Amino acid sequence: YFQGEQVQRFGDLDVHYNVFNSSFLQPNVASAVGLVRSKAQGVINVVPMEKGKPVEAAVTGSAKDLTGKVIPLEFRRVSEEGAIYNLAQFPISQRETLVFTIKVEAKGEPAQTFSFNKEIFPDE
């Protein structure tokens, strides 16, 4: 899912990411990471890259709301149709602005961390 895709760049390391409703996940992709597709659940996809090529990485992170409540994120790796994805699910209970903090540990490389804001909208 490319709609709303963003890129954070750290020299050679280009981190592509997107936050969307888990209903937009393909059934085979969701099953592979054990996520039950639900309008009540969001998903974040993190795809790290170097020189236009995908790189193996440990992706970790969390999201925080305005009350300081931390939403833990557990990323799971899935390789579907040659493309490698790092997906984490999170519940959507209401309209909210979340601050996402993601850490990317690419193979043999020092860790990189980035943050971004995302407005979450529950779906009917």
Side-chain angles (χ1 to χ4, degrees), residues 40-50 52 54-80 82-113:
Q41 294 288 315
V43 61
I44 177 174
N45 186 26
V46 174
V47 185
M49 274 169 179
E50 291 178 42
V55 65
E56 193 81 327
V59 179
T60 65
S62 64
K64 183 151 70 178
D65 73 20
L66 299 182
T67 71
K69 179 186 181 183
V70 174
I71 302 86
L73 296 169
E74 287 307 327
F75 286 87
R76 288 166 187 179
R77 194 175 292 106
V78 54
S79 70
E80 288 295 352
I84 194 89
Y85 301 130
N86 301 279
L87 300 164
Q89 66 171 12
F90 60 91
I92 303 170
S93 59
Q94 59 186 294
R95 288 266 297 103
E96 58 190 357
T97 295
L98 296 179
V99 180
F100 284 82
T101 302
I102 309 301
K103 181 166 76 170
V104 177
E105 294 182 350
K107 182 86 178 298
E109 300 303 341
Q112 297 286 6
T113 300

Side-chain angles (χ1 to χ4, degrees), residues 2-43:
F2 220 123
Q3 214 281 337
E5 191 187 90
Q6 297 278 48
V7 186
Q8 197 101 1
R9 297 181 169 95
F10 302 100
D12 44 21
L13 189 64
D14 308 303
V15 181
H16 293 239
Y17 61 98
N18 199 14
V19 181
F20 52 97
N21 194 272
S22 71
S23 306
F24 292 112
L25 283 175
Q26 296 181 3
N28 65 309
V29 174
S31 300
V33 295
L35 164 42
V36 282
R37 292 159 70 213
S38 177
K39 295 172 192 295
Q41 294 288 315
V43 61

